[PDB]
Design a protein around this ligand. Structure first.
Ligand SMILES: CC(C)CCC[C@@H](C)[C@H]1CC[C@H]2[C@@H]3CC=C4C[C@@H](OC(=O)CCC(=O)O)CC[C@]4(C)[C@H]3CC[C@]12C
Ligand SMILES: CC(C)CCC[C@@H](C)[C@H]1CC[C@H]2[C@@H]3CC=C4C[C@@H](OC(=O)CCC(=O)O)CC[C@]4(C)[C@H]3CC[C@]12C
Ligand SMILES: CC(C)CCC[C@@H](C)[C@H]1CC[C@H]2[C@@H]3CC=C4C[C@@H](OC(=O)CCC(=O)O)CC[C@]4(C)[C@H]3CC[C@]12C
Ligand SMILES: CC(C)CCC[C@@H](C)[C@H]1CC[C@H]2[C@@H]3CC=C4C[C@@H](OC(=O)CCC(=O)O)CC[C@]4(C)[C@H]3CC[C@]12C
Ligand SMILES: CC(C)CCC[C@@H](C)[C@H]1CC[C@H]2[C@@H]3CC=C4C[C@@H](OC(=O)CCC(=O)O)CC[C@]4(C)[C@H]3CC[C@]12C
Ligand SMILES: CC(C)CCC[C@@H](C)[C@H]1CC[C@H]2[C@@H]3CC=C4C[C@@H](OC(=O)CCC(=O)O)CC[C@]4(C)[C@H]3CC[C@]12C
Ligand SMILES: CC(C)CCC[C@@H](C)[C@H]1CC[C@H]2[C@@H]3CC=C4C[C@@H](OC(=O)CCC(=O)O)CC[C@]4(C)[C@H]3CC[C@]12C
Ligand SMILES: CC(C)CCC[C@@H](C)[C@H]1CC[C@H]2[C@@H]3CC=C4C[C@@H](OC(=O)CCC(=O)O)CC[C@]4(C)[C@H]3CC[C@]12C
Ligand SMILES: CC(C)CCC[C@@H](C)[C@H]1CC[C@H]2[C@@H]3CC=C4C[C@@H](OC(=O)CCC(=O)O)CC[C@]4(C)[C@H]3CC[C@]12C
Lengths: 206, 355, 105, 52, 46, 53
């Protein structure tokens, strides 16, 4: 078919395909589907720059994507979302093996957006520790109630999680509430074996 | 003290070390049952091993039920992305097949023994997988996964050259055998071990057509040279040289440059897979596989008694506003720093001086 | 190597030998035969023996050899896999490792 | 006889050649073809090793 | 096979496209040479 | 760090002061890696030890 009047539902499924995992977008949601079924400020997004840069990444308009990344909020989440969308489009273009320069520049766009997320994490790290922590761990009400670290590990961004902020977070989560931290492996086998040994093990106060 | 032991047992590092100690104990239990007599009824050690396998299968079915996608066909797909998971399911099904063969009488009990041996094989690799927690061993496992493709290409080219020489040797020395399936074994048996040391010095260039001396001085009439069988030492020499020297040292060079590729990554992919290890060992219940039945019954009782009748930190609106304002300050600082670095570069100074 | 080698050792000791009591010689049999495979000799007499067949002796007498106790054609195949993977893969891996560490030192 | 056995020898060396020609045929792959090229490059160093 | 036959007018279009391409390439080469650092340093020194 | 360089500028026995500060910085870097805190301070203690050396 000509497929004129492409619905926002259909490109929503394209984000379902491209993002992967369990990324439930707002378009795929039945709550938005009843509104879209109704109209064959109600039809006004609270965050226009999000879907504008989603449109820009989907149609390959790179400079518009950077400009929409400049404005609005949740720049980190937007950067990782655009990075995984660009990488997934590059993988689909290599799988369909079209003209190879567009697969090259989709991979280049994915590297650019991932690099932008990296420097942004570095600047947040140099600015404030706990604020960057809360930025890296808070819930993402506009993107499937995920978190930015989940979008990073979906995006396969090895350099983002190789940063010391995420490594510090994974180290904190690794020990959990226990904070003895002196020759950890030998002390934990002395903790499980001979179970009365954790009385000399110090813990985080609430 | 109770909250202290709850905090200690709920940590992911303690849960991981508990899991790997239980896995090592299970593996040595497997070794002990596979090395000793298995009678008409299974022993206590075999009961521990089947209990481990069945509870591990129930745990995997539980993680299937408690996955993040809501569509049930999508859960098995997103679990089939991981290769370890599907090979774990394959081995659990193999153990079930071997148990249902072993619990019968003869001759199926020996077939259960074969299945038990190939299951050791798999669980020793899975122990190799479990070692990937170390910041040095994990990169080594990654590199082994990278070199498996070059191994497969070596397998193809060796296969061509080796069974070429095998067909020639099997058809020069042996012109007088009927069609039978032992011909393929003779093709693939003698030329394979030539690469790895022993060259079968007794079985090559035998003196034919000559009354060679026996032990007690009696010249026994040896069978004659059936064909011109001086060809097979020469093509033996050519095959051994080309195979060993050429392709082994080729794969040495291949492994060298692929190690050059993967050493520049090194710890970064380990830090990448650290998150996946974190989430798997935080989602997992506190008790290990042998005793995960206790956790399963207490979670069934909790979710059908008090309910049927991780890194995701929740953030209020004002703290979201503070986080957002911090974010805008950060991106604006970053862009000011980028512009200042670009204006402080040498080429920009040269260009503006020329203008 | 220890993991891969004694994996093959447990399999070979439990396929060919299903009829021995608990004794400490089982560990020596696990660690003895697979270790020397890396370094030359591959024990060509002790692998794939003709079982279940009246093989000829020295003085033309077909002696009744012991039968194949289990499906013991498995152990040459996993022998081939172990020898290939062990020797080729990990030796040339440590060759590359020694090369870049020599570049460091 | 005895020329039929000589035909058998010629048939065996012709296997040898047609297995290499199969190696040649494998060069269509974007990974195997470079490997065949490298083997052709290393044959000269093989010849120098053969001499020494 | 790959040898595609081409009429006179399409040959003229192909030729004109070719001259436009080589002239663009040489303009781009000259602009890159004048935008290099060493040329800027030399002309600043003069 | 900058106060350390400035005090290294003045006074006597600059060589001895440089090696003493180098071993103090290297020992602090080893202690910070052994306690495995935020890794950038272990990096810049190693950097300070390299600078003084
Ligand atoms: C799951 C991993 C962490 C292993 C944990 C160790 C224990 C839970 C198990 C492992 C091996 C078991 C032993 C294996 C064999 C025997 C012999 C068994 O004795 C007999 O079978 C003969 C006498 C009889 O029939 O009672 C008595 C139990 C015992 C000591 C078992 C007791 C419980 C042990 C120590
Ligand atoms: C690192 C931690 C997790 C180690 C946990 C494992 C051990 C506690 C297990 C592994 C294998 C077990 C052994 C496997 C088999 C036996 C034989 C068993 O002897 C019998 O069953 C013979 C009894 C009879 O025939 O009368 C005695 C226990 C013992 C040594 C077991 C003792 C406990 C062992 C060492
Ligand atoms: C005793 C003998 C006969 C056993 C045979 C040994 C091989 C079958 C083993 C040895 C090392 C193993 C490899 C070690 C590391 C890895 C990485 C690991 O895979 C991944 O990390 C990627 C999986 C994913 O990304 O989903 C498991 C497969 C693989 C290639 C293993 C495949 C099986 C190998 C080649
Ligand atoms: C070219 C490369 C990539 C592959 C080479 C494959 C060969 C090694 C295979 C393919 C066809 C096979 C043959 C196909 C059929 C038979 C008949 C088969 O006969 C029986 O099993 C019993 C027959 C009877 O007694 O009636 C014995 C093996 C044999 C000769 C096979 C021997 C091995 C062959 C030559
Ligand atoms: C391309 C790479 C990655 C793998 C290549 C694997 C094949 C070359 C192997 C795997 C299965 C093997 C077969 C498995 C079983 C047999 C039966 C075997 O015959 C017998 O066991 C009965 C006759 C006898 O030998 O006494 C002869 C070899 C043969 C055909 C094997 C020939 C070689 C095969 C095809
Ligand atoms: C180090 C590099 C340069 C490789 C050089 C190797 C060849 C020069 C040698 C190695 C083994 C030799 C072969 C070893 C044994 C024989 C069998 C021999 O056969 C007989 O004498 C007939 C016996 C009979 O009739 O029973 C003929 C020479 C030949 C092919 C030899 C030819 C020369 C070969 C190929
Ligand atoms: C999983 C990897 C990392 C380690 C594998 C270790 C196994 C090779 C060990 C651990 C438990 C050992 C067994 C523990 C107990 C015994 C009983 C022991 O019996 C005796 O010494 C005499 C018993 C009697 O006659 O009563 C003989 C060795 C054996 C089978 C051991 C054989 C070697 C085993 C299987
Ligand atoms: C991790 C790396 C760095 C070192 C690994 C060392 C182990 C794999 C070795 C060291 C000590 C060895 C043990 C030393 C002594 C014996 C007794 C030996 O039995 C006997 O000597 C009596 C029975 C017989 O064999 O006749 C069987 C092997 C065993 C368990 C050995 C098994 C292999 C062990 C545990
Ligand atoms: C060079 C690369 C591609 C590796 C290829 C190696 C395999 C294709 C070969 C090497 C040794 C072969 C094995 C050597 C001996 C046997 C025993 C043989 O067993 C029998 O014939 C039964 C004997 C009996 O019943 O006593 C079955 C085939 C098998 C497993 C062979 C299967 C094919 C193997 C694994």
């Amino acid at each position: 078919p000509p497929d004129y009047r492409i619905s926002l539902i259909d490109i929503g499924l394209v984000i379902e395909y491209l993002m992967g995992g369990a990324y439930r977008c707002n378009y795929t949601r039945k709550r938005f589907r009843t509104l879209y079924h109704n109209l064959f400020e109600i039809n006004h997004f609270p965050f226009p720059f999000h879907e504008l840069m989603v449109w820009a990444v989907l149609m390959k308009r790179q400079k518009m994507a950077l400009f929409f990344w400049q404005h609005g909020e949740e720049a980190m989440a937007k950067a990782l979302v655009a990075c995984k969308l660009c990488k997934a489009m590059a993988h689909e273009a290599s799988e369909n093996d079209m003209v190879d320069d567009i697969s090259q520049e989709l991979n280049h766009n994915s590297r650019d957006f991932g690099q932008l997320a990296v420097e942004l994490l570095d600047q947040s790290y140099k600015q404030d520790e706990q604020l960057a922590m809360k930025l890296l761990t808070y819930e993402l009400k506009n993107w499937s109630n995920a978190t930015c670290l989940q979008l990073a590990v979906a995006a396969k961004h090895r350099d983002f999680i190789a940063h010391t902020c995420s490594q510090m977070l994974l180290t904190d989560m690794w020990m959990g509430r226990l904070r003895m931290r002196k020759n950890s492996g030998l002390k934990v086998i002395l903790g499980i074996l001979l179970p009365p040994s954790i009385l000399s093990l110090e813990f985080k106060n609430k | 003290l109770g909250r202290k032991i709850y905090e200690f047992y709920n940590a992911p590092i303690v849960k991981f070390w508990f899991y790997t100690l239980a896995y090592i104990g299970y593996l040595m239990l497997f070794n002990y049952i596979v090395l000793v007599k298995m009678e008409r009824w299974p022993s206590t050690q075999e009961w521990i091993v089947i209990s481990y396998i069945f509870t591990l299968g129930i745990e995997k079915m539980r993680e299937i039920l408690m996955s993040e996608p809501g569509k049930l066909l999508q859960k098995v797909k997103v679990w089939l992305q991981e290769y370890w998971n599907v090979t774990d399911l394959i081995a659990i099904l193999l153990f079930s097949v071997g148990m249902i063969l072993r619990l019968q009488d003869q001759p199926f009990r020996s077939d259960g023994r074969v299945i038990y041996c190939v299951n050791i094989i798999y669980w020793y690799i899975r122990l190799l997988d479990i070692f990937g927690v170390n910041k040095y061993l994990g990169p080594y496992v990654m590199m082994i996964g990278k070199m498996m493709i070059d191994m497969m290409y070596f397998v193809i080219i060796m296969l061509v050259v080796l069974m070429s020489f095998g067909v020639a040797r099997q058809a020069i020395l042996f012109p007088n055998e009927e069609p039978s399936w032992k011909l393929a074994k003779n093709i693939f048996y003698m030329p394979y071990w030539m690469i790895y040391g022993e060259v079968f010095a007794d079985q090559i260039d035998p003196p034919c057509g000559q009354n060679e001396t026996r032990e007690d001085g009696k010249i026994i009439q040896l069978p004659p040279c059936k064909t011109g069988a001086w060809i097979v030492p020469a093509i033996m020499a050519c095959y051994l040289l080309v195979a060993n020297i050429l392709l082994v040292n080729l794969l040495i060079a291949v492994f060298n440059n692929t190690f050059f590729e993967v050493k520049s990554i090194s710890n970064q992919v380990w830090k990448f897979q650290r998150y996946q290890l974190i989430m798997t060992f935080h989602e997992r219940p506190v008790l290990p596989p042998p005793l995960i039945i206790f956790s399963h019954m207490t979670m069934i009782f909790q979710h059908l008694c008090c309910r049927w009748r991780g890194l995701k930190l929740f953030i209020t609106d004002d703290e979201l506003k503070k986080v957002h304002d911090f974010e805008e300050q950060c991106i604006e600082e970053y862009f000011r720093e980028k512009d200042d670095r670009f204006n402080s570069s040498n080429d920009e100074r040269i260009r503006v001086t020329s203008e």
